[PDB]
Design a protein around this motif. Structure first.
Motif: not given
Lengths: 97, 568
Positions: A1-30
């Protein structure tokens, strides 16, 4: 598992999702409560960036499990995404922290 | 047109020849206390006289009856008396009650020689013709700008002089109507006294850098009262600077060298010599734009500061202690950010002068320090005489501070300005949160009863500064229209209220045509009307009509009459 997470490809995809939900995901609020904490901490001019760990599992939860298993790297990724959100909400708030 | 603009030099030479006595002083100087431009003009006159070595006595005055009693004290031999911006509209001759026949020597051809000749330079606009033309002893310096426009009024007044029939009766009545047309008008100023003084110096050609510098200071003092007048005179001042700029360019700074620059200035008090955060904090325009009085004002201030990306602790630290690496970049940062907040109009070019390695000081900073030193440099009527004495002392202190060597005293005035801005801010936020303003839709009314510094507040200039701050706050709130500003303060030592009637003012940057037309202070006419009948024992001895001292008990009927008054 940790080796898979170690892949910077996986890391960059997670970064994209992180930026996505950071502002885009407006939980329970506008508006994204995380976005609300952004530029509010900017107004507070601090470095913490509280998350509450909720709205993370609530936001598709794969990032949540990934963090719970192998934090450190995606904590660093969170710091990067914090950088982009930082200069986004407040330009020039970079080089402050 | 008593004194032509070009004829100013001729009048000056006449004054010289009248007082051309090194052995015997024949000149006395009378100046309104608590006016920066008046102080600049007095410095002008002092330098001119020391050039001519003419003996002269300089007296600061605050009260009109003080002027009368001093004139009674004055010796008749003094053929030269100068008045600086006070009483021009009111008929001083009537106020003086002089007999020209007593004064005239050798009436015969006809010439009018008086053993006392009193020359009056006034900043007030109404410019009573009878005051101007009733007596030749009353010597009025005329900008021409009011005078030529008063040509219809001047000829009507002349006709009234001639006529002392139904057709002639109705003509006289129409002339009287015209009088009332320029009467009942709130007095203002369109000419910084320093400006026409320096114009006369240029006519004599004695202008130096200091003369232009002091003219800049006087105009900067006028700026808050009349921004548009300052803006209009600004290119003239810049052109005269170019006329007097030294040839040497970008020379290495050395202690001997003194330079004055025309570089962008930011509408933040004491910006160089104070911090950034504080300079924003007590800035009246900044406060009104950001509603800094409320907590959300502070929130927005922090938001905008972070928008510039300036670290907080850096911001609250002084501008002089700032690293230049950021200091140079500040202007463009505001250019990028103030507009986003709409705060871009605050940036504007200004005159900042430096000498040697002391540092650069804004003319705005200079006038702030001067005002502070005036304000806090140091039975009941006797106590009021004591306050007048202390205000004269503060005037002399400010006079002294204008000298270069008293940089320390200038720093003291700087500190006083910081303290006064702080106290004014505290009082304003206190009254705002408590909603102590009570607008009666005829005039927004606030009164001072509790809270400290009332002794500071009863000093007229402090009240004026607080009034300017609150006018700025109300004007930036465009939701409510412009309404008259009335303010009343108590002094327990005198146990009577202190009142200043402030005319409404447009927000800065308001270049709209309706904002081009200035507002006239109806407060003055209301006060005069109240004094005329059912007077509440107010005091009008002060050179400012708007500022009035009233019995605290009698102020309530005064407000009732103000509500009754329709001219407000």
């Amino acid at each position: 598992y940790s080796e898979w997470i170690t892949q910077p490809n996986v890391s960059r995809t997670i970064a994209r999702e992180l930026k996505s939900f950071l502002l885009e995901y407006t939980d329970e609020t506008g508006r994204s409560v995380y976005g609300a904490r952004i530029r509010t901490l900017g107004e507070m001019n601090s470095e913490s960036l509280e998350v509450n760990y909720r709205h993370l599992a609530e936001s598709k939860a794969i990032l949540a499990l990934f963090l719970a298993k192998c934090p450190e790297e995606m904590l660093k990724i969170f710091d990067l995404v914090a950088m982009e959100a930082t200069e986004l909400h407040y330009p020039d708030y970079a080089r402050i922290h | 047109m008593y004194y032509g603009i070009s004829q100013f030099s001729e009048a000056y030479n006449k004054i010289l020849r009248n007082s051309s006595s090194h052995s015997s002083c024949q000149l006395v100087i009378f100046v309104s206390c608590l006016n920066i431009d008046a102080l600049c003009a007095t410095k002008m006159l002092s330098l001119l006289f020391k050039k001519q070595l003419v003996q002269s006595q300089i007296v600061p005055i605050f009260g009109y009856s003080e002027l009368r009693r001093h004139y009674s004290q004055l010796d008749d031999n003094i053929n030269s008396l100068l008045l600086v911006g006070f009483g021009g509209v009111i008929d001083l001759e009537a106020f003086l009650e002089i007999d020209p026949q007593e004064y005239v020597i050798d009436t015969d051809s006809g010439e009018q020689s008086f053993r006392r000749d009193i020359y009056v330079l006034d900043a007030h606009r109404p410019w009573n013709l009878d005051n101007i033309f009733g007596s030749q002893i009353i010597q009025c310096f005329d900008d021409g700008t009011v005078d030529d426009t008063l040509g219809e009024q001047k000829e009507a007044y002349y006709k009234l002089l001639e006529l002392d029939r139904k057709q002639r009766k109705k003509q006289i009545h129409e002339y009287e109507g015209v009088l009332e047309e320029y009467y009942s008008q709130g007095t203002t100023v369109v000419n910084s006294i320093s400006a026409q003084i320096y114009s006369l110096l240029s006519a004599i050609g004695e202008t130096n850098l200091s003369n232009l510098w002091l003219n800049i200071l006087g105009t900067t003092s006028l700026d808050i009262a009349y921004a548009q007048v300052y803006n209009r005179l600004y290119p003239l001042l810049q052109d005269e600077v170019k006329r007097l700029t030294p040839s040497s360019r970008n020379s290495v700074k050395t202690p001997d060298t003194l330079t004055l620059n025309i570089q962008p200035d930011y509408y933040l008090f004491l910006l160089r010599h104070s911090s950034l955060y504080d300079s924003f904090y007590y800035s009246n325009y900044v406060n009104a734009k950001l509603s800094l009085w409320n907590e959300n004002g502070k929130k927005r201030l922090h938001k905008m500061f972070a928008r510039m990306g300036i670290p907080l602790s850096t911001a609250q630290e002084t501008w002089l202690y700032m690293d230049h690496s950021i200091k140079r970049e500040l202007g463009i940062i505001f250019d990028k950010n103030l507009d986003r907040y709409g705060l871009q109009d605050i940036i504007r070019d200004g005159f900042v002068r430096t000498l040697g390695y002391r540092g650069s000081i804004s003319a705005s900073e200079f006038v702030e320090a001067l005002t502070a030193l005036l304000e806090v440099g140091n039975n009941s009527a006797q106590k009021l005489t004591n306050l007048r004495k202390r205000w004269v002392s503060n005037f002399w202190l400010s006079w002294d501070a204008l000298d270069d060597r008293k940089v320390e005293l200038l720093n003291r005035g700087i500190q006083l300005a910081q303290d006064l801005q702080r106290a004014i801010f505290n009082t304003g936020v206190a009254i705002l949160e408590k909603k102590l303003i009570k607008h009666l839709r005829i005039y927004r009314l606030c009164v001072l009863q509790d809270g400290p510094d009332l002794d500071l507040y009863r000093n007229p200039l402090t009240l004026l500064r607080l009034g300017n701050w609150l006018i700025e706050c109300c004007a930036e709130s465009e939701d409510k229209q412009l309404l008259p500003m009335v303010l009343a303060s108590i002094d327990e030592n005198t146990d009577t209220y202190l009142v200043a009637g402030l005319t409404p003012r447009y927000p800065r940057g308001l270049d709209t045509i309706h904002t081009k037309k200035p507002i006239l202070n109806n407060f003055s006419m209301a006060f005069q009307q109240i004094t005329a009948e059912t007077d509440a024992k107010v005091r009008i001895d002060n050179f400012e009509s708007s500022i009035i001292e009233i019995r605290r008990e009698d102020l309530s009927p005064f407000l009732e009459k103000l509500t009754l008054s329709g001219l407000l």
